[PDB]
Structure 1
Amino acid sequence: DRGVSTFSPEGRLFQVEYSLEAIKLGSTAIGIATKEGVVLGVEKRATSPLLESDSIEKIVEIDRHIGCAMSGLTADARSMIEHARTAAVTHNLYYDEDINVESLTQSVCDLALRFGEGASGEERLMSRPFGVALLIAGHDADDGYQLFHAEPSGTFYRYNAKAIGSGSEGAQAELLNEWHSSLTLKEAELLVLKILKQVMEEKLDENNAQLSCITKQDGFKIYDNEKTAELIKELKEKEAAE
């Protein structure tokens, strides 16, 4: 066949590029940063009404000041999260301090290219790249509120707002306009809820959608259905308001 770590004539790694395709099919995930905190929202997307929607975990806590949302082959993200949590915890054990959000991100990205069938450079054991992207949101004393997009390519970017998943391209264009450096957490919450609503096949309710945020004071928290339902309602009213 052809090695899993081969280059295309255009200078790209086949397996990584294809990896990106699988992610385009994933459920929508959106993150928005504001000087008041960072909001992280995702599209549950149950494959049947018999599926208890709350058993759908696509937003997880890495540390008290770091959480992330995933999109793509989500089973692949388990080891990623495990590594991430261990890194945050370990850094605390070794330095008596919280891990910087960027470092945590870099740490996760370092696993990314660790695949192959015998790549000369160390001992990269993992037959294929991960098929899932992550939005890592958190806060640290050095650069405050931050939002990161980490891909199977091993690269990561910092964003003020970012959307990944099936509805991404459209949602990103949206964010491109909607976002401005003076948004409040509440405004961010509604904006996420709004864009999710627009790109979701399903009618957004507090069962097929989920919100969460990270703030210096209370850290990373996942909004429970009730809290989100009201924000959804509050949104319908403001929209119909004009």
Structure 2
Amino acid sequence: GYDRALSIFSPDGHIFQVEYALEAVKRGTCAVGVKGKNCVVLGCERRSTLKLQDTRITPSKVSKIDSHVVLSFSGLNADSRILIEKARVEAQSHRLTLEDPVTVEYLTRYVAGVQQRYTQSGGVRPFGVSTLIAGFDPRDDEPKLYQTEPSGIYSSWSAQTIGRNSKTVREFLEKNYDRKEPPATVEECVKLTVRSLLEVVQTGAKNIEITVVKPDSDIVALSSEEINQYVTQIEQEKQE
């Protein structure tokens, strides 16, 4: 078996392969997560150098891990499928032994552990992927949003973004998000998420995806027209 230690320390104490995996994440399309008073919203950028696409069949950016948890990502697309598959299998395994679906924290902790294992195992390179994992714990109405990265560290966020130009949209969210008063409704939460993507995206046409998760396995994806209404409304208020 191929044994080579690919992820190793350098003289300055850095693991370059892990750090170069973060550069792959920086190249990926932007993804944002914002949690309100009673919901979490996941927004995702889709690059428009690809026309003649078939959006019916093309892999969606936000993936259901279970009926109550979702996972979006930034970075290598092929890599993300491996993490999503493993997560989906662990979700069913947890239901089987514990007789209770996973908590968002647990599912995040598992995915993060997989990423960490690929940073000190022989013959493998780290995942070129950072994830945003959102949902609601079983029989709980408190919104949950977590982030993971190639190194394996994970943490909880009131609102967070990853991918290209994420530092710009993080700047926006840092002044536009009040901890004392999170978006009270679904509409408010979606609007703040769309606003934040409009700082970076280009056109609000078929470039933005929005997915809303509410308590008790209530997940739905918005259509073009529904999202376009938020885009139209925001621009008219801007001209002031």
TM-score, normalised on structure 2? 0.89
| Distance change (3 Å), C-alpha of 1:125 and 1:87 | farther
Tell whether 2:112 aligns with 1:115.
no
CA drift of 1:237 comes to 2.9
Are residues 1:81 and 2:84 paired?
yes
Q: 2:31 aligns with which of 29, 32, 39?
A: 29
**Tell me, which stretches of 5 or more residues in structure 1 are unaligned?**
none
1:148 aligns to what?
Answer: 146
Q: How far apart are residue 87 of structure 1 and its match?
A: 1.4
Asked if 1:191 is matched to 2:192, the reply is: yes
Distance in 2 (alpha carbons) for counterparts of 1:139 and 1:129: 29
Alignment of 1:29-178 (within 5 A): 29-54=31-56, 55-115=58-118, 124=121, 127-140=124-137, 141=139, 144-178=142-176
Instruction: For residues 143-191 of structure 1, give each alpha carbon's deviation from its aligned partner in whole angstroms, at most 9, with x where no partner exists.
Output: 8211111111111111000011111111111111111132123222111
Calculate the aligned-residue CA RMSD, in Å.
2.0
> CA offset at residue 220 of structure 1?
2.4
Q: CA contact under 8 A between 1:92 and 1:99: conserved in structure 2?
A: yes
Structure 2 residues not aligned, in runs of 5+:
none
Partner Cα distance (2:163, 2:49) in 1: 17
CA distance in 1, matches of 2:141, 2:19: 31
2:234 is matched with which residue? 235
Residue identity opposite 1:130 in structure 2: F
Contact map agreement 2:133 2:147 (CA 8 A) in 1 = yes
How many angstroms apart in 1 are the aligned matches of 2:134 and 2:55?
A: 23
Displaced runs of 4+ in structure 1, greater than 6 A?
none
Per-residue deviation, 1:217: 4.3
- Percent identity reads 34
* 1:170-220 Cα shifts (integer Å, max 9, x gaps): 1111111111132123222111111211112x3121x11100021104522
* Counterpart residue identity of residue 187, structure 2: K
Q: Distance in 1 between matches of 2:189 and 2:122?
A: 40
Task: Report the secondary structure of 2:70's partner residue.
Answer: strand
Q: Distance in 2 between matches of 1:128 and 1:209?
A: 31
Q: Does 1:204 align with 2:223?
A: no
Distance 1:155 1:47 in 2: 33
| Number of positions where the alignment pairs a residue of Structure 1 with one of Structure 2 | 232
C-alpha distance in 1 between matches for 2:48 and 2:85 = 24
Secondary structure of the 2:130 match is strand
Query: Aligned to 1:70, what secondary structure does the other structure show?
Result: strand
